[PDB]
Amino acid sequence: TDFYSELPKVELHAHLNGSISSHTMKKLIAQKPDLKIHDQMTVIDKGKKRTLEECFQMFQTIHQLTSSPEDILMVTKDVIKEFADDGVKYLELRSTPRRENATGMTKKTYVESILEGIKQSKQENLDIDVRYLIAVDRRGGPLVAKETVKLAEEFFLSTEGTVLGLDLSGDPTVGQAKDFLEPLLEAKKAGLKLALHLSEIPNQKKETQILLDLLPDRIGHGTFLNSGEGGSLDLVDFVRQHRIPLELCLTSNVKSQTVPSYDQHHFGFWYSIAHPSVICTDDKGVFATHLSQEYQLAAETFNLTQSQVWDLSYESINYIFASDSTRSELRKKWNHLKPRVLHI
Ligand SMILES: C[C@@]1(F)[C@H](O)[C@@H](COP(=O)(O)O)O[C@H]1n1cnc2c(=O)[nH]c(N)nc21
Ligand SMILES: [Zn+2]
């Protein structure tokens, strides 16, 4: 199915360390053989499923391989090339900055390695516009969140468009929403866009209403927003009235068992009311997928025609964090490619 890879795509929810390919993972393993890490410890194969906690544990393993600014630079360049080769024309990468005293890496030089990877990818004339959202991990705590937000505010102004926002990710069972309200509001006031992971697990309704009050610019997952266990008509209505785009990750929810099957994924629910939604990979390496494969899975599961898949891809341009100028350029690119992608 060449249509899904040829189809121009936007990627808005992709975690850098979760997007590492098998090829790049093997190069990192070759550099650190003393770690005794194997490639099957970092990937969930087709037909296999793990718990959400088991997924989080795999990130601890991957984080041991990417410990220096050179590792972050190589990972950034490889991930960008892999997305561009898959037909992605605009990518918003997500990553939590980390210090590593053993290598001299700081949260600031972690971000600078990502920006350097984006700069080197432009020098190679790749057909992809890459932006960066600084991710706050719930496990880091509220003090590290304040430092990360301050760092993001500085790069938001200095990069003039490369750094566009802030994300709140990591274990949804760790910490309280109230602990992150102040730094997230600070970022919102500075002009940063917010992409918050919400309703990933059941029975977290109060916590979800607290983060929804921040008025995020995009919501990650929103799996249980309509569920009686952790969601309500009020939460759905709030997301509907405020037209908050949902970043939907099909393979991610199925392989982490937060959804029983592709057929029962909440994509169908939100698609039925034409609510703003974007198909995303989440962690293309950990979940062994590509954005083209996610589009194919959504099209085959929900019986969408190529023209209906085209409309989804074209509308997703509206939900990027970049300016109207970028949206306009992307729309022109899509309409130029359209007769080569859609055939009689
Ligand atoms: C659990 C993580 F914080 C991982 O440590 C990180 C990996 O990417 P990076 O931020 O580049 O290190 O991405 C986050 N992450 C990766 N996938 C997910 C996910 O499905 N849900 C949530 N809540 N967070 C996720
Ligand atoms: Zn995510």
Numbering used by the authors: 12 to 355
Authors' account:
Bemnifosbuvir (AT-527) and AT-752 are guanosine analogues currently in clinical trials against several RNA viruses. Here, we show that these drugs require a minimal set of 5 cellular enzymes for activation to their common 5′-triphosphate AT-9010, with an obligate order of reactions. Crystal structures of human histidine triad nucleotide binding protein 1, adenosine deaminase-like protein 1, guanylate kinase 1, and nucleoside diphosphate kinase at 2.09, 2.44, 1.76, and 1.9 Å resolution, respectively, with cognate precursors of AT-9010 illuminate the activation pathway from the orally available bemnifosbuvir to AT-9010, pointing to key drug–protein contacts along the activation pathway.
ADALP1 is a deaminase acting on N6-substituted purine nucleoside monophosphates. ADALP1 is thus able to accept the 2′-C-methyl, 2′-F modifications on the ribose part, as well as several substituents on the N6-position. The solved ADALP1 structure adopts an α/β-barrel architecture similar to that of ADAs, with the essential Zn2+ ion tightly bound in the vicinity of the catalytic center. The asymmetric unit contains 8 copies of the protein. Although ADALP1 was co-crystallized with the substrate AT-8003, the product AT-8001 was found bound at the active site. The compound is found in all 8 chains, and all the chains found in the asymmetric unit closely superimpose (RMSD of approximately 0.26 Å) except for the minor loop and N- and C-terminal ends. The structural zinc is coordinated by side chains of 4 residues (His 24, His 26, His 208, and Asp 293) and a water molecule, in a trigonal bipyramidal geometry. AT-8001 is buried in a closed hydrophobic pocket that can only accommodate a monophosphate compound checked and stabilized by Asn 28, His 74, Ser 106, and Thr 107. Once the substrate is bound, the catalytic water attacks the purine C6, which likely stays at this location while the methylamine is leaving in the opposite exit channel. In the case of ADALP1, unlike HINT1, the substrate and products are superimposable in the crystal structure, indicating that this complex should be reliable and useful for drug design.
